[PDB]
Design a protein around this ligand. Structure first.
Ligand SMILES: *C(=O)[C@@H](N)CCCC[NH3+]
Ligand SMILES: [Mg+2]
Ligand SMILES: [Mg+2]
Ligand SMILES: [Mg+2]
Ligand SMILES: [Mg+2]
Ligand SMILES: [Mg+2]
Ligand SMILES: [Mg+2]
Ligand SMILES: [Mg+2]
Ligand SMILES: [Mg+2]
Ligand SMILES: [Mg+2]
Ligand SMILES: [Mg+2]
Ligand SMILES: [Mg+2]
Ligand SMILES: [Mg+2]
Ligand SMILES: [Mg+2]
Ligand SMILES: [Mg+2]
Ligand SMILES: [Mg+2]
Ligand SMILES: [Mg+2]
Ligand SMILES: [Mg+2]
Ligand SMILES: [Mg+2]
Ligand SMILES: [Mg+2]
Ligand SMILES: [Mg+2]
Ligand SMILES: [Mg+2]
Ligand SMILES: [Mg+2]
Ligand SMILES: [Mg+2]
Ligand SMILES: [Mg+2]
Ligand SMILES: [Mg+2]
Ligand SMILES: [Mg+2]
Ligand SMILES: [Mg+2]
Ligand SMILES: [Mg+2]
Ligand SMILES: [Mg+2]
Ligand SMILES: [Mg+2]
Ligand SMILES: [Mg+2]
Ligand SMILES: [Mg+2]
Ligand SMILES: [Mg+2]
Ligand SMILES: [Mg+2]
Ligand SMILES: [Mg+2]
Ligand SMILES: [Mg+2]
Ligand SMILES: [Mg+2]
Ligand SMILES: [Mg+2]
Ligand SMILES: [Mg+2]
Ligand SMILES: [Mg+2]
Ligand SMILES: [Mg+2]
Ligand SMILES: [Mg+2]
Ligand SMILES: [Mg+2]
Ligand SMILES: [Mg+2]
Ligand SMILES: [Mg+2]
Ligand SMILES: [Mg+2]
Ligand SMILES: [Mg+2]
Ligand SMILES: [Mg+2]
Ligand SMILES: [Mg+2]
Ligand SMILES: [Mg+2]
Ligand SMILES: [Mg+2]
Ligand SMILES: [Mg+2]
Ligand SMILES: [Mg+2]
Length: 232
RNA sequence: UGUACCAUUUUGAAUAAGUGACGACUAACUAUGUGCCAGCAGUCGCGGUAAUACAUAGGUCGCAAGCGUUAUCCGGAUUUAUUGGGCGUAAAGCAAGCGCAGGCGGAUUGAAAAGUCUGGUGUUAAAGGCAGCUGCUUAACAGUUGUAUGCAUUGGAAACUAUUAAUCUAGAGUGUGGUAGGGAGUUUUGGAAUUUCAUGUGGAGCGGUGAAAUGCGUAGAUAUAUGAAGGAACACCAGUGGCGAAGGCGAAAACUUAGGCCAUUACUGACGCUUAGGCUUGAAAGUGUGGGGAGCAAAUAGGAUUAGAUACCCUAGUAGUCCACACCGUAAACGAUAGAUACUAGCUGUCGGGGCGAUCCCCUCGGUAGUGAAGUUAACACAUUAAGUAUCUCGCCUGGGUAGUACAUUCGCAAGAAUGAAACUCAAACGGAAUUGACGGGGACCCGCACAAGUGGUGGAGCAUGUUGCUUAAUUCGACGGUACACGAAAAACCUUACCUAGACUUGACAUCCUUGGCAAAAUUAUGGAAACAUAAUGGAGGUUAACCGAGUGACAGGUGGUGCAUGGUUGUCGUCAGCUCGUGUCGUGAGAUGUUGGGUUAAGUCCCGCAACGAGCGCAACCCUUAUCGUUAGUUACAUUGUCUAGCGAGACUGCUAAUGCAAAUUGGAGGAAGGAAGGGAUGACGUCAAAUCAUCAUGCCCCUUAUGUCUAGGGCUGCAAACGUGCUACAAUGGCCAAUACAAACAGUCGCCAGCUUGUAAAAGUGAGCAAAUCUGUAAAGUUGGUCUCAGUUCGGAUUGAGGGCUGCAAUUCGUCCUCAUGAAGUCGGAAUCACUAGUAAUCGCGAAUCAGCUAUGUCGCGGUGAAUACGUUCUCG
RNA sequence: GGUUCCAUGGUGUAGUGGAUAACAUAUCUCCCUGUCACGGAGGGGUUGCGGGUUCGAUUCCCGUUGGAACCGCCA
RNA sequence: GCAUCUUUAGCUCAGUUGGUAGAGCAAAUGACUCUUAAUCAUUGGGUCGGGGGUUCGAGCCCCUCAAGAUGCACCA
RNA sequence: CUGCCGAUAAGGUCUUCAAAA
């Protein structure tokens, strides 16, 4: 049957919001809401070879702050800070010159156990004509070796160019979806294949959060260092 | 025959490549076209608008001066099985027996030598066959030498078979001695019971069924008691049994008669097994002649049931069922297993003879059963009574339908029996066994407003809204049992809008990429205008082009156009039901089984035990939110009748204690407690099913349009109307209508808004106008209490419809907004067959608020509080 | 050629001694079921043509059509 | 022979008794479905057998032909 | 505790593949 979004079921209890701002009026609540979606989509659609895991947005009456986590930030940084200037101009055109931006790339730790880049890698493999069975298994084994709990991958679509759509799942371990205390990270991606669209869904279990609180604490960014800059 | 061949003879790549296939068997794939059409096919099968199977093209593969197709023969085919198959459940053991000819057949001795083996000789024509060699440029081919097979004759071998001459008893029979039987035929005899009749008593039904009705009965039935007549069959005994070759045999007796078991110091001395043809017997039905006929009952008549009933039920009812003599010769005639012979673990019964002598029990020899290993089988299963290891003999089988049909023949009075095909057609078969599911008008157990017990409704009337159908220029599109129909749509006058009629536009209303400049787009005022749009004006923020304003410019933009049966995403449903699987191991040739099923306990695959299973994952449960009590922090904009109230943290409830019984989980009761055994509610919805819903939220493969299916605007339309259905509102009333006074909420919302008060107005509202960015100000609570009146009427019920006058929003209210006032006063007096929801603050009912919104007969949707019930005995029926 | 009968709903048939027309099937709407048949409720639909009598004709009278049933013989 | 009737889209038949034609099938088109069947809507399709005559006007009334079928004589 | 209880148009998907990591 149908299931409630795993990310959406855990918001406001154990998971913080990706955008944290309070608008002035119901007219300014819509502009500030579509614009941040454009920024997030920009980061995700293009600049994909970087493995951007999550982009957070922080806005005040007039000051915009962006916290961008990536696995390989060299591509964003570019050759002696070139590509970086380009993206700043991109961000300024979307929000406006009248405001103040404080974009912040922040390098990420433990990149494997994140459902976003795994789905992106999965989608790239399917688009690259890689056999589906082999592609998921290599991603599954590497993620488990990274030192996490069970992972559930559902890859539904016109499998292998077939005319009848199927779906292949591969769970390997305890994925307690009905439990609220668990840390389940979820992401979904659309692999654009020449024979249509492939939907990949990745459920990852990253332990149990036994410390009550609406997070305010990082998630799989702590193990190695996490810095770099571009801020003020 | 100037032929093969030869040569440094001239010229010169010049004179020369096709066919089949490409989904699998079977080496070799893509596009275009078509769209269950045209076509392909040796087999499985491809084609229903994304075809590697069709057509064309490109590529590739298999062959080659050949390649495919067709025809015929052999192999593969162990698929007529001598080598080399089978007959319990798949085709196939005759219904059984007596059996001649045929086949086979105990042991020992002698002879012969017909089979059998071997030596010599003759022959089995030449070509061909196989081996070697030679010759053609090697080969194909030609020649060359070698190379068997059988028959006859002759000379030996004597193990086995056959023949002959004899001996023996162990095979098989005979006799004596024990002995068990529903074995058969013929002739007599007996008692219950039914029916009819005769005689009494008696007095209204009997009979029959799911329920009844034909029928019988005051002419005295049913019933009761006695008697007589007659026919058929032989309760109990009677069986985890007996006899016979089979069919079959069960009251008692007599006569005749068949076979069998056990022990044999007796006798014959292979006389034995099987059996084509032949003969005998052979359930029931049926036939012919003559008797008999109580009961029952094919055919038949009537009454029921039924859409129909020539059937199941009931009441009658002939042939027949019975006997004697003649036929018929078929059955699931079954142990679905032909007969005979020898061998191969065991255990438990039961019957008969014999040995012992109370039975009972022990042993021996046989008959009849159950369980069971090796062994066999495709599996089920058989297993000393074989379907096991083997031999002999007979019968029978060779895919399914045609078909046990047709012709011919034999038998029969007759129906028919025996024997028994083919033409044609299919790729399989009402094939066999077993496995996983589904289903059952099959069982066992357990659940849910399912039934049951109640309450209030719906189907009847008026109105609102959605749908079907019809119409129209359009009535845009989708949803269509449960799981569509107050659904998408949380707002159709314009806009929305996707539709129709018209007036206008073409790299376009919007976008990027490119050569190139920016010294604008807006908005608004004029004129023509239905408005789109044009011609003229202030020429405009800014920042030198940032963004945009453009020119030039072709790739293109654009599509609510098709396909939810190509999809991604999201959702309904079973269902918040308790399920769905995996790893390792074990069993099974295999699909598969195990765990996951057994016993207890739950809402639960929840847990505990048992257990060839041991564990694990998803679901279940808990962690999350909210309501119920209290502690702590805080005290304004709450409270201020002083500790409410509001929201942060925490305590509290954990089967924690006790009693009962259970191994243990756990169930029930009690204690204390605000709360007791998921304390109430919410979020949370496994694998999957229905090719379930959506291309019209969005995204997207493919197809289609490209001065039009794209774009702008005005008007119309989505609001129609002979009709039908669904969901709601209002009612049909005194538990009420109207009027007056009046008490008690929670939640939510608010600066183009909430709007207090005041003034005007019969009122919707207008003007003035504070207060409130909000625990402060505003959004009148109604049912309810009291008083007056109506007095049961189509009314002081009910409000539809209609006419007029007003108010608000908005350019604009006619198509098509709602509110108020006045006027009128349809139907309707509790609603047919049949249906829906609900297990406590629930049903019922009364108001209040919010979302989308300028406004909206939203009576809709999402929320909040006021009052506040009835019933649950139980699973027989009903749905899942 | 002559004589008797009949003409009623969409189909098969009753009635009316002048004042009045029903039955069954069929048809329609609604329960019913996954659906349909069957079942349940309710709804609907009629005198061959003509011409006279009567206040009034399906009925009574005379003619005209169509369909049937009887006869048409003696030489 | 005679008297009588009939000839009507592709087929089977009503037309009405004079103002010039439909019904039911078949075909097609859509709708409808995965696609069909079925269903449903819609729909094109006529020398009223050939000529003559009457009439202002003939599928309609009267004649002659062409092709069939009826009832009356293969002399009672 | 034996009422009654009938039917359901045709053809169709779906396993691509282990060479292996
Ligand atoms: C019999 O029928 C006769 N009267 C008829 C003779 C006819 C001759 N033309
Ligand atoms: Mg071909
Ligand atoms: Mg082809
Ligand atoms: Mg062969
Ligand atoms: Mg052979
Ligand atoms: Mg065989
Ligand atoms: Mg057989
Ligand atoms: Mg036998
Ligand atoms: Mg037999
Ligand atoms: Mg014998
Ligand atoms: Mg003999
Ligand atoms: Mg020779
Ligand atoms: Mg030769
Ligand atoms: Mg007697
Ligand atoms: Mg008999
Ligand atoms: Mg009868
Ligand atoms: Mg009887
Ligand atoms: Mg008889
Ligand atoms: Mg037989
Ligand atoms: Mg056995
Ligand atoms: Mg045959
Ligand atoms: Mg035979
Ligand atoms: Mg058959
Ligand atoms: Mg089965
Ligand atoms: Mg009830
Ligand atoms: Mg109603
Ligand atoms: Mg009605
Ligand atoms: Mg519609
Ligand atoms: Mg649809
Ligand atoms: Mg549905
Ligand atoms: Mg409009
Ligand atoms: Mg300027
Ligand atoms: Mg410039
Ligand atoms: Mg499109
Ligand atoms: Mg679907
Ligand atoms: Mg077990
Ligand atoms: Mg168990
Ligand atoms: Mg839960
Ligand atoms: Mg569908
Ligand atoms: Mg309009
Ligand atoms: Mg509407
Ligand atoms: Mg309602
Ligand atoms: Mg009162
Ligand atoms: Mg105050
Ligand atoms: Mg009335
Ligand atoms: Mg009223
Ligand atoms: Mg109006
Ligand atoms: Mg009343
Ligand atoms: Mg309940
Ligand atoms: Mg009510
Ligand atoms: Mg209904
Ligand atoms: Mg005479
Ligand atoms: Mg369709
Ligand atoms: Mg019944």
């Amino acid at each position: 049957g149908q299931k409630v979004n795993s990310n959406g079921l855990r918001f406001g209890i154990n998971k913080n919001w990706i955008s944290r701002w309070t608008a002035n009026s119901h007219a300014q609540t819509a502009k500030w809401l579509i614009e941040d979606e454009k920024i997030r989509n920009l980061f995700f659609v293009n600049y994909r070879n970087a493995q951007v895991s999550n982009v957070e947005i922080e806005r005040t009456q007039a000051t915009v702050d962006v916290f961008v986590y990536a696995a390989q930030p060299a591509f964003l940084i570019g050759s002696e800070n070139k590509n970086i200037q380009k993206i700043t101009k991109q961000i300024k055109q979307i929000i406006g010159r009248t405001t103040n931006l404080d974009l912040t790339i922040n390098e990420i730790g433990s990149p494997m156990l994140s459902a976003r880049i795994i789905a992106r890698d999965l989608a790239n493999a399917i688009e690259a004509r890689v056999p589906l069975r082999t592609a998921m298994r290599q991603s599954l084994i590497k993620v488990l070796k990274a030192g996490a709990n069970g992972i559930k991958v559902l890859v539904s679509g016109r499998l292998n160019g077939a005319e009848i759509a199927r779906d292949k799942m591969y769970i390997e371990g305890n994925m307690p979806l009905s439990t609220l205390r668990a840390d389940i990270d979820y992401a979904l991606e659309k692999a654009q294949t020449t024979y249509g669209v492939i939907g990949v869904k990745v459920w990852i279990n990253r332990g149990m959060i036994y410390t009550k609180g609406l997070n305010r604490t990082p998630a799989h960014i702590l193990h190695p260092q996490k810095k770099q800059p571009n801020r003020q």
